[PDB]
Structure formats: C-alpha cells, structure tokens
Symmetry: D2
Subunit: 123 residues, 4 copies
C-alpha cells in the first residue's frame, strides 16, 4: 500500500496531510492544521505496516507532528494512530492524542484525545 498511502489527504476539519510511504515502512511529510495554535506546515514522521494481511484487513499506521515550525510553537505534539482502508473511496481512520508540555501540577490536563478521518478528496 505504498502507492495507496502516498499522496495528499484531507480530514473532516479541512486539515491537509501530505505523506510519502517508504518501501521500508517509513512515513514522511507535512501536516497543516485548519484549527488550533497552528500556522502553515509542520514536519511529520511515522511508520506503517509495509506487509499487511491479505484478508481484507486495514493497514496499521501512525505518525507524529510536534507543533513547532518557523512561524509558531504551541509546545505540544499530536500522534495519530489508525489504519488505511484502500479502495474507490480510500480512507485513513485515526484516533489521536495531543499532549501539551505542562507543569507537573497541570499534567492531569495535558492530553486531548480525538478522532480524524482522512480522505483523498476534500469535504
């Protein structure tokens, strides 16, 4: 699914996920968030299962963005964990965790959780 994953994806919020899937299982690219303390593109990196099951299962993957670029630093990082589902209407279905750097006293409220669905076509 190197070819299937590589490309430009869009989530339900209007964020843009630009990714290349390497033959070795690497994910590289850029993320631009339509929401939050974010401007322009941020580096991402991750991994995917480069030899998925041949039984109709999805392809497991995940990636991270730290929310620092040349424009802004939100002192936070999001990880997306999910699976790629191929076909006519290909999708990456994810859940995510966004951790902010906090003091120890505020660490209980450090992490947001959500879910993003990416498609090859904008909404």
């Amino acid at each position: 699914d190197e070819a299937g994953i590589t490309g430009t994806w869009y989530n339900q919020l209007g964020s843009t996920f630009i990714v290349t899937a390497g033959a070795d299982g690497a994910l590289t690219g850029t993320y631009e968030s339509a929401v939050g303390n974010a401007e322009s593109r941020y580096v991402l990196t991750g991994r995917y299962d480069s030899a998925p099951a041949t039984d109709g299962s999805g392809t497991a993957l995940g990636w991270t963005v730290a929310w620092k670029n040349n424009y802004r630093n939100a002192h936070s990082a999001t990880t997306w964990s999910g699976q790629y589902v191929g076909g006519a209407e290909a999708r990456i279905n994810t859940q995510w965790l966004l951790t902010a750097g906090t003091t120890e006293a505020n660490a209980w409220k450090s992490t947001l959780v959500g879910h993003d669905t990416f498609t090859k076509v904008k909404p």
Copy 2:
C-alpha cells in the same frame, strides 16, 4: 533537551526505548516490547519540541512503532504521546494508542489505549 532525551529508557513493563533526539526536532531509534506479539527491536520515529517553554513545563513529544520487523508482523502500530520531564529522576510520561489492522466490521475494536512511564533506570 536534546541531550536529556537522547539515550536508553525503560518503561514499567520492562520495555526498552532507545532514542536519538535531533537538533531539528526528530526522534529516531528502536523499541523492544517486553509484552505482546513482539520480538526483538522495531524501528521508531517521531518528533519533539526542540524549543520548549522555559517556565518549568515539560517537553512535548511523540513517536510511532509499526510492529513489523524481520522476525514478526503483528499488523499493528502504537503511537506514544507525552512529555519529557527533566531532572535527577528524569521521566517521559506517555499515553499510547495501539491500532491493529482490522476488517471494517471489527474496526470498533481496533484500538487499545494505555499509559507508559519511562525512566533512565530499569525497574
């Protein structure tokens, strides 16, 4: 916190997280899980905030492992999202999401969630 994050970390389960923090915000290394459908080391890659706040907050970071190596393939990927807290008892406090590749019918039960705490000394 490049020097502080770079090195060998151990979680509460006895897993080993070997990481290098790059000047550019990259995380690269290997993970060895003490539990689950896993043997030996797996590639990891992620990101950290390379210019964190100077107010005593932690340093946000995250990384991904896809559970495929030369020995085994669990058709799954884990992402850790958390923060590095420096000092005498340095720690990385994380929450994680483990997504397995599934059929669409089983996608509701695709993703496990948990929390791991890493220290520079083994338990």
Copy 3:
C-alpha cells in the same frame, strides 16, 4: 435539555441507547449493542449537566454499561463521555473506553478506545 436527551438514540453500528434524563442530572436506561460479546439489553446509568451554558455550547454527559445481563457476561464495562448537541438533527457525540477484567500481566491490553455518534433516527 431534559426533553432533548430523553428518548431512543441509535449509533453508527446500529446499537440502541434508551435513556431518561432526570431533572437532577441523572441518566438511566438501557443499551443494546449491535456488536461484540453482547445480547439484548444492559442497564446503564450516568450523569449530564442539567444547567448547560447558554452560549451555543453542547451539553456534557456520560454513562456506563457493565456488560452483564441475564444472558451473558463479557466481564467488561464501557463508559461513554461526550456532549449532546440539540436542534433539527440532534446528536450525542461521544468517545468511549471499554475495560475488560484482566490478570495483572494482561492489564496493558485491558482497554479499548473508540468513538460513537448517536442520532434520533436510525
């Protein structure tokens, strides 16, 4: 939103959530899962914000089902945490945690997480 929340709701899997919202903030009712080690209805209880903000924000709520009834016991419990959004196409948007009883050795894989969206029409 007592009136708005009380009733029968359906999620994207075809599960059925039957709830009464009490004036005091209680949620009581039954849940029937279309998936998993489940059959028929299970008791639920939870809570909701009975005096929500007047600024167009949703209404926070949550509830629990332990997956034991007279038919089956899956030795697990799910909690839904979310908000009610009123209007012509009312919805309850949730994220959930399903914890199974495990040995200590297996506790790292005890808990599934997911998200369910409920509407008043199937």
Copy 4:
C-alpha cells in the same frame, strides 16, 4: 466484590471517591476532585461486573461525574473506565475521559484523557 469495592478511595492527585457497590451491579456515591474547576462533592453513578471471573482477573467497572453541584458548574463530565484488583493493597486502575461542552467549532478540543489509580489508603 461488593464488599471490596464499597468504601472510600483516594487517587494519586488526592481526590476522594466515596462509593457503594450494589448487589445488582450499581455504583453510587460522591467524588471530590483535588484539581480543576471543582469544589466539594459531586454525584456519581456507574456500574460494575457483579459476577466476575474466578481466574485472577480484575473486576470491570466504570462511573460518571458531571461537574455540576450546588457550588460550581464546569459544564463538563468525566467517565472513569477500569478494573478493581482486590487483595492487600487493593486498587482500582482507571483511564478517564473528560468532555467539556463546546461549540461545534471547538469540538475537536472538547475531550481530555488521562489515568487515575485509586487505593484504600491516602498518599
């Protein structure tokens, strides 16, 4: 585990969870948070497995608090999902989701996730 669960529990933050476990699987009681937009006690309700496995497994349970009482209203609700592990040093190990009421535009940042461990003795 009716007897084992019923009573007063304390988490790592100093919060107090006062619960009665009913023969029918009900959980009832009060919660007092040591942190956040909270003062005094809040109603809780939930459920537990009243016929757990006899194989050394924990006892699944969960409960909800809506953060409204006579003193304050944080327009939010937390659910704890976890298991009771009996014995000397009995514990309830949980993960939680805190959802705030939000506008639709802010719904992506509505929900915090974390983990709390409760014991029968205070920290």
